[PDB]
A paper describes a structure:
Specifically, AAC(3)-IIIa and its fellow isozymes catalyze the transfer of an acetyl group of acetyl-CoA to the 3 position of the aminoglycoside’s canonical 2-deoxystreptamine (DOS) ring. Here, we present three crystal structures of AAC(3)-IIIa isozyme (isoA) from Pseudomonas aeruginosa in complex with 4,5- disubstituted neomycin and 4,6-disubstituted sisomicin and gentamicin. The substrate promiscuity of isoA is due to its tripartite active site, which can accommodate a variety of aminosugar ring attachments, this architecture was first described in APH(3’)-IIIa and subsequently found in isoB. The isoA crystalizes as a homodimer, with four molecules in the asymmetric unit.
Our structures of isoA bound to sisomicin and gentamicin are also allowing us to outline this enzyme’s specificity towards 4,6-disubstituted aminoglycosides. For sisomicin, the prime ring binds to three water molecules which can coordinate the sidechain of D170 and backbone ketone of G213. Unlike the double-prime ring for neomycin, sisomicin’s double prime ring is stabilized by a mix of water-mediated and direct interactions. D72 can form direct interactions with the 4″ hydroxyl and 3″ amine, while it is also responsible for a water-mediated interaction with the 3″ amine. A second water molecule mediates interactions between O-6″ and D211 and T212. Sisomicin interacts with one final water molecule at the N-3 position of the central ring, which is coordinated by the backbone atoms of D170 and I172. The catalytic efficiency demonstrates that while sisomicin and kanamycin are both 4,6-disubstuted antibiotics, they are the most and least efficiently converted substrates, respectively. Based on our crystal structures, we can deduce that the N-1 HABA substituent introduces a steric clash that prevents these aminoglycosides from binding to isoA. It is predicted that hydroxyethyl chain on plazomicin’s 6’ position would be able to be accommodated, as homologous 6’ amine of sisomicin is solvent exposed.
Residue numbers in the entry:
A (entry chain C), C (entry chain A): 6 to 265
B (entry chain B), D (entry chain D): 6 to 266
């Protein structure tokens, strides 16, 4: 029997999902196992557990962001500058490695999408506009970001068979933490401005690799080991539910004590 | 006979105010009628309907802003430059014509205040810091303003016996709208910088008079006439509740269709 | 006798015109009086005093710009939108009020014309391409204008019997000056884009009326009174030669001290 | 015994320096040897050979540009962002490796200085304003730069005892040349905007190291070998005089023949 909508709603509630929460999801469709109706039902079941008074958010980003063009031969870079489409929030596809579920939520009715191409988040529910509003282009995991707002409203992160190393929220802890040295990246990206394509430079902390000798999986496992979060099964998947505020506080302290 | 806290909470909920909303208030104490406990109870009842996870904001401005000193004679202007106090967000009083309720909210526990003196907004609640953060000095009703943020987070405007012409949000619609004519003003203002008084010049669109042949009352009356918002009584006052995003969109289209490209 | 080429050259040199200068001209043919060979000889004599290493520029604009159509009834506005020709820099005639000399210079061999229709400038000589390049559509008397470049390369303005109120350079001073009140206008204009007519909206400061209680005649006469420029006769005309940088600096200070 | 103004003027003229030319100088004071009156007289003799109808330019840059702060510990970077002064063109000192002569010219009467901090050029003479005008912040050795204008007005470059590897003009050839790959740098810099310090990001091609397996010394030596320029002694210094237009054309073809795609 493929997992049903009802069995998923009930499992989310059993794990601790409650009406009105703001929740960021990381998931693996394959870890959940076959669902009756496909991955839509994972999203709908989670939405139903949250009710319309709650909010569901995922990290979408942009699968085709051409942030790498300075490494290309100059003549090819020039073609990119002429021919590559800009980030259009209506069409820019989600990063495939963020789960097909992120692309499914990005194209969900009543979705809101944040404006930072590389860090773009999508949300559905009562606080979806709030979470995705005024997402600054520079330092997209920092103070002017959906992650800051998720912490401020005491939201949650649900890991649904997704590896612990993929928690995007810990990039916000990296932004906050006073560390010996953090790597800054400056990269090009085409956006829409007054309906026309414009290439801009985006400045951010590196989010492709850690700033020092740590991993997100290590921080998350240490968090679990000292009693943080709840754990349970949802479909076939091992699931973890974390409070965003407590996990961010823990991770900032973890980073500053080891690398400050 | 005076309106009670409970009856005000019920009236706000009947109008459509819900837990967690971000709400900007324009109000007349006299229009509401006598409240048991005074105007504090209007603010508290509204906060209670919003809950601490909602947010209540008002336009405070600065009652004593000396933005007029350029039209004084040189000798008097010199006295102002020397003697007028700077905008101190801890003490600068709210504009009296913004209702005593704005000054009451400005002095409420856990209030946050935006840094633009002339355009200063005050808020209490979960998004109060968010709404009031990084309020740019120039174009204070524009893209870096609490009004832009109220629109972005899909907040609301509540008119509680206040004239429709007083909706500050429509200055943000003026900022957004592409119009054949705009008046740009530069005016002086004393502020605090590194703990010291410094006189600066602020640039903004004129918000004292319209940029063309319209009024805010007209726009708002037209919005209501085509079904915008909800209406209901709160105390003795006729109240209107508007979605900030829908009203701004309507007002921008209204201005652009009449004066636009 | 009509004035000769040789006597005009001598008069220009006596006034202070030197080889290699970049010069913007405002002129009245009638004030100069009849010239042997007509107004062509005024331009050629000036070009000869400047030599090919100098540059001569004038304000052309567009005599037929339909910037007034938004105020017409819909039915007439519609006809303008469909039937009025776009700004074609090869054919768009200079504003007649700018002197026939501006249209004569616009049609001179080796002329360069700037792309802003309402603010269009025409130039012949060594820096003609430099002065007329990349003239932005918005704020056409501003930072991206031939007037800004004339100031930046320390060019000159020659008034050849033209009223001081007609100095276009003082609109650049208005743009630069920090003033208590500015009128900003948006108006329609047909242009060519990829060889097709397209209607665009242009944003600019109002240049039809001052922004406050002043006139250009007032500013320039004050400049002359404090020793600015040199004066002399050219033909029958009273002529004034101003340094573009010094006049702009003076006018900005004049505006800011009174309205800033 | 020390070299005199008159002998320096003649030595410059012997190379081909003429009245009215626009000339960019690279120099070593030590290579020239002691001059009667010091390095001022080198500049004045060159100016006198060029006459007031000519123009003299040097690369000043900014000795204290804090373009390296991202490599510092975060806490030290934070101090720089707060405390390091911005580029003020009235005071920012010339890079010392560009010769004390560049700082001497930067402080010369009637000097003009271009606005790009890292690439800042200083010039005195008839076309000094033109050469230094509207120097773009990004790609400061490219199309909107003093080097582009020096090429356009058919100016010259004089190497006065300076190593051929230090010719700034060849960074403009690097900018122009269609090469297989050029390294792009983006770096921070504090500037003045409306009288206040602002930190901005500057984008440019790398000018600290070549983009491929070449050196400027090698290009210039090849230019000389095929008959380009003139050479002679000025004081104790070996001098080279290059036409900017011909050298830029030669260098672009040189780079594209060897490293193009
Ligand atoms: C990388 C990772 C997503 C891979 O997980 P996964 O289960 O293999 O991949 P997805 O969740 O995208 O599911 C894909 C499956 O959905 C299924 N599916 C069901 N209906 C589908 C449909 N209409 N269209 C496409 N796929 C569909 C398919 O079986 C597909 O697998 P297939 O192409 O092999 O046939 C996962 O291990 C992970 O890391 N999750 C966390 C990711 C994250 O949040 N990163 C944030 C960056 S900070
Ligand atoms: C102008 C306007 C405020 C007048 O409304 P109002 O009801 O007369 O005035 P207020 O709301 O300030 O209420 C004043 C009353 O509060 C009462 N009050 C109760 N307790 C009070 C107290 N401790 N202290 C002071 N006043 C008190 C008083 O009776 C006072 O009236 P009084 O001084 O005549 O005795 C109203 O018509 C209006 O325009 N509101 C919208 C304004 C706005 O929001 N503008 C935004 C700018 S875009
Ligand atoms: C308005 C102003 C141009 C009128 O000056 P003017 O001397 O009367 O007019 P012009 O310079 O255009 O000269 C016109 C004369 O050129 C003569 N002329 C000679 N050859 C001519 C020819 N081939 N074709 C046409 N006219 C010719 C004609 O006699 C003509 O006069 P007419 O039409 O009455 O017979 C002048 O007073 C002025 O203000 N100049 C400054 C304008 C300016 O620079 N504005 C900038 C905008 S900010
Ligand atoms: C690096 C380089 C400048 C060093 O040359 P240099 O002759 O040693 O140095 P300078 O030209 O700065 O001259 C310094 C000498 O000027 C002399 N001098 C005379 N008057 C002086 C004065 N008032 N103040 C300071 N120094 C003075 C001093 O002897 C000083 O040397 P010292 O400090 O050892 O006593 C030279 O080899 C070079 O590379 N020139 C090319 C520069 C260039 O254009 N770079 C741009 C790269 S694109
Ligand atoms: C398209 N260009 C890319 C650019 O979008 C950006 O992507 C980041 C991505 O790698 C991060 O995932 C890595 O890190 C984590 C935790 N250590 C585990 C999985 C790893 N893959 C992700 N959490 C956040 C993304 N912003 O940085 C890298 C890049 C190559 O430049
Ligand atoms: C202290 N100096 C003043 C300065 O603060 C500013 O005040 C503005 C105020 O008038 C506006 O209220 C007018 O607008 C209409 C709506 N059309 C409703 C009532 C009208 N009075 C208000 N909505 C916004 C304020 N920023 O401009 C004017 C000024 C005199 O300079
Ligand atoms: C075609 N439509 C017109 C549009 O081109 C623009 O014309 C301007 C023109 O009037 C200005 O001349 C006035 O200014 C004073 C200087 N105080 C001298 C003479 C006055 N006539 C001129 N200097 C600059 C022009 N850009 O504005 C007005 C307009 C009607 O909209
Ligand atoms: C302050 N930071 C520095 C920044 O100003 C910039 O300096 C450049 C400078 O090195 C170049 O000189 C090198 O190259 C040449 C020919 N290959 C020979 C001498 C070499 N030293 C000079 N020609 C142009 C300068 N723009 O780049 C490097 C930097 C460290 O980032």
């Amino acid at each position: 029997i493929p997992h049903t909508h009802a069995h998923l709603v009930d499992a989310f509630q059993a794990l601790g999902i409650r009406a009105g929460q703001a929740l960021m999801l990381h998931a693996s469709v394959k870890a959940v196992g076959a669902v009756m109706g496909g991955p839509n039902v994972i999203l709908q079941a989670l939405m139903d557990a949250l009710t319309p008074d709650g909010t569901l958010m995922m990290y979408a980003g942009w699968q085709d962001i051409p942030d790498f063009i300075d490494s290309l031969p100059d003549a090819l870079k020039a073609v990119y500058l002429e021919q590559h489409p800009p980030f259009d929030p209506a069409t820019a596809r989600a990063v495939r490695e963020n789960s097909v579920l992120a692309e499914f939520l990005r194209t969900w009715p009543c979705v809101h999408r944040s404006a930072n191409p590389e860090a773009s988040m999508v949300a559905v529910g009562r606080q979806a506009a709030l979470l995705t509003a005024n997402h600054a282009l520079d330092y997209g995991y920092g103070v002017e970001s959906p992650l800051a707002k998720l912490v401020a409203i005491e939201g949650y992160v649900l890991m649904l068979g997704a590896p612990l190393d993929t928690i995007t929220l810990l990039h916000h802890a990296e932004y906050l933490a006073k560390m010996r040295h953090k790597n800054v990246v400056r990269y090009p990206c085409p956006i829409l401005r007054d309906g026309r394509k414009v290439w801009v430079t985006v400045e951010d902390y590196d989010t492709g690799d850690p700033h020092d000798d740590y991993s997100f999986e290590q921080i998350a496992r240490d968090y679990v080991a000292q009693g943080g979060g709840t754990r349970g099964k949802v479909g076939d998947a091992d699931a973890y539910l974390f409070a965003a505020q407590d996990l961010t506080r823990f991770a900032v302290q973890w980073l500053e004590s080891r690398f400050g």
